[PDB]
Amino acid sequence: MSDFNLVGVIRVMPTDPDVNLDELEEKLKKVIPEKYGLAKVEREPIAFGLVALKFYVLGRDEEGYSFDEVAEKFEEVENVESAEVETVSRI
């Protein structure tokens, strides 16, 4: 087929308000495995001083692709409190 037919949006919550965001994204973007693609990075700041990051990761609906997998790789990065897969959709 050659394209991407799925998108999984992973929400990452930083450990605390003081976390440098630009650096976080840059680190997370390179932790994204080779076969996945990036479609969009969004910031959703919250009232308490923190700002959640939303990654729209591209993949395929075939063995070998696991959005929970990249969420986990995301959780290994420093200053990341947690990474979850909010939803997955066909594209």
Swiss-Prot record:
Membrane-traversing stretches: none
Keyword Lipid biosynthesis: no
Any one GO molecular-function label of the UniProt entry: translation elongation factor activity
InterPro entries in UniProt: eEF-1beta-like_sf, EF1B_bsu/dsu_GNE, Transl_elong_EF1B/ribsomal_bS6, Transl_elong_EF1B_B_arc
Keywords in alphabetical order: Elongation factor, Protein biosynthesis
Gene3D superfamilies linked to this entry: 3.30.70.60
Described purpose of this protein according to its UniProt entry: Promotes the exchange of GDP for GTP in EF-1-alpha/GDP, thus allowing the regeneration of EF-1-alpha/GTP that could then be used to form the ternary complex EF-1-alpha/GTP/AAtRNA.
Family to which the UniProt record says this protein belongs: Belongs to the EF-1-beta/EF-1-delta family.
PANTHER family xrefs: ELONGATION FACTOR 1-BETA
Protein name per the record: Elongation factor 1-beta
Species for this entry: Pyrococcus horikoshii (strain ATCC 700860 / DSM 12428 / JCM 9974 / NBRC 100139 / OT-3)
